[PDB]
Each structure stands twice: as C-alpha cells, then as structure tokens.
Design a protein around this ligand. Structure first.
Ligand SMILES: COc1cc(Nc2nc(NC(C)(C)CN)n3cnnc3c2C(N)=O)cc(OC)c1
Length: 271
C-alpha cells in the first residue's frame, strides 16, 4: 500500500521527540510521545547514511510479526528524516537491565521466568516461518512490569525452503552465532536456538560477555573440538543441560522453541 493508504503512516506532527536514547552511524533513537500522551520509541535514519529502502524494510517486516511477546510497530514517517515508531519498553535492553540494582536483586525464579517469555516469543517466530538471526540479551527489551520482548528485526527473514543463505562477505557476532551460520552463512530457526543458548548464559550471569577470557578464534577452536561454554558461575545444572541441547552439533538435533518454552515454565513453577 502507498503511504497515503498505509495504516501505519502518521503525519510527523503527531510525534514529539523528548529524550535521545541513542546515536549511531545510521541514525538516532528517541523517547517521545504520540499525540501528547502515548509514550513511544522513535528511530530516525541519518539522511544518506544508508538506503531508506533498507531502513524501512524492518518496519515492513514488523507489520507481519505481531505478537504480545514481540516489540510492536507503532507507525512510520516515510518523508525524510524517516521515522520508525515502535512500542516503548520502560526498562530498556535486557543486557542493561540485569546490571541495575533492580535487575541484580532478581532471583533465579524470575530469571527463569524471563527466559521462558523470550522462548515463547521465538516460538511465534518459529511457527510463522521466520528467523531472527540476531538473538541476544542486547536485543531483548524489558517492560515496566518486568516482562520481556523480542526486538530489532533488521536481520530477520521469511523462509520458504528451510534456510536463508546470507551474502558472501557478511560477518556476524561469532560468540552468539551458530557454526553453520558462521561457516556456511546458512541460517535456520535452529541457528536462532543456538543463540538462545548463549542468551541463557547472558541471563544467568546478569549480562556478562559469553565465553569469558576467550577470543573468537579460541571460541571457534574449542567448539570444533567438542567443547561448549564452561559452566557459568552459579548456574542451575538443569538450566545448563538445556543450554547444551541448544548447542548440539547438528541443527536438526537442537530443540524447538516451543519445547524450550514448555521446559522453562516447568523450571519456573518448580521454584
Ligand atoms: C538509555 O537506555 C534506555 C533504553 C531504553 N529502551 C531502549 N533502549 C535501546 N537501546 C539503546 C541503543 C538506546 C541504548 N543505548 N533501544 C534500542 N532500540 N530501541 C531501544 C529502546 C526502546 N525501544 O525502548 C529505555 C530506557 O529507559 C529510560 C533507557
């Protein structure tokens, strides 16, 4: 649909950038209000920094992935500067929330609770035939009521024939990314499951960098041997073995996201 018909298009005047949350190479991120009262998050593209089509492809993707456990597209402004307006999450990114006094005080009970909400979010993605490709504590947002949601669908893709194969020279964060995706650039929902495994280490350690004291090559070198991440400090052994399922060598042997949710919920109530 063209902008004058798109239900997600709003006139820029309805918006009001109030507090800048981030500034990067490709644009900025603001906290603002829509029509005076509704708090929202605004992402603006830095004119010329990148393709407007590429910037907008994300919103277009979010129109297809609507769920309670996924950050929700609020609207767009398709004139320059382009805006992508989305649901506001009061407690910011998970990786940061876990480092605050509030986050620090969270029990393993609540840590498992949150892990289960993320997995439930990925289960919806899983079934709708999407992959995320960028799952990590940084890309999980936290609400004022301490609930978690999937965010940043920039790399996310729709899938027909099982897998999406990335460009030839594209590079991804090595620690969080499944071998087959690093090695062959082939992504499946099972690539996401592996990241979830890394995500659980981030949760249980309160946002610590996975594979402590290890460089990427040391990490690649250990995995190829059969090793996986050393049991993180203070980590229920149950949760650790779940981590291992996510880290099985063959993608098809790794669990579904639906199974993961179920498992974590049992871990949650049993405590
Ligand atoms: C400065 O850190 C905060 C971030 C967010 N929330 C968000 N944080 C980041 N992270 C940044 C990059 C702003 C941290 N520098 N995002 C990134 N993209 N969206 C967001 C977002 C949001 N939608 O609410 C909320 C918040 O409460 C006062 C504080």
């Amino acid at each position: 649909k063209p902008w004058w018909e798109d239900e997600w298009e709003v006139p820029r005047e309805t918006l009001k950038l109030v507090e800048r949350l981030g500034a990067g190479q490709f644009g900025e991120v603001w906290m603002g209000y829509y029509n005076g009262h509704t708090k929202v998050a605004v992402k603006s593209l830095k004119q010329g920094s990148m393709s407007p089509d590429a910037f907008l492809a994300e919103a277009n993707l979010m129109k297809q992935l609507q769920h309670q456990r996924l950050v929700r597209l609020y609207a767009v402004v398709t004139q320059e500067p382009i805006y992508i307006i989305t649901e506001y999450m009061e407690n910011g990114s998970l990786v940061d929330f876990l480092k605050t006094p509030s986050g620090i005080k969270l029990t393993i009970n609540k840590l498992l609770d949150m892990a289960a909400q993320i997995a439930e979010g990925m289960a919806f993605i899983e079934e709708r035939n999407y992959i995320h490709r960028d799952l990590r504590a940084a890309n999980i947002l936290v609400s004022d009521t301490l609930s978690c949601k999937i965010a940043d669908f920039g790399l996310a893709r729709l899938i027909e024939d099982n897998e999406y194969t990335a460009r030839e020279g594209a590079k991804f964060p090595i620690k969080w990314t499944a071998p087959e995706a690093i090695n062959y650039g082939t992504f499946t929902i099972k690539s996401d499951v592996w990241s979830f495994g890394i995500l659980l280490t981030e949760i249980v350690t309160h946002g610590r960098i996975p594979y402590p004291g290890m460089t990427n090559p040391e990490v690649i070198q250990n995995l190829e041997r059969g090793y996986r991440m050393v049991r993180p400090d203070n980590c229920p052994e149950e949760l650790y073995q779940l981590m291992r399922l996510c880290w099985k060598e063959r993608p098809e042997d790794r669990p579904t996201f639906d199974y993961l949710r179920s498992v974590l919920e049992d871990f949650f109530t049993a405590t």
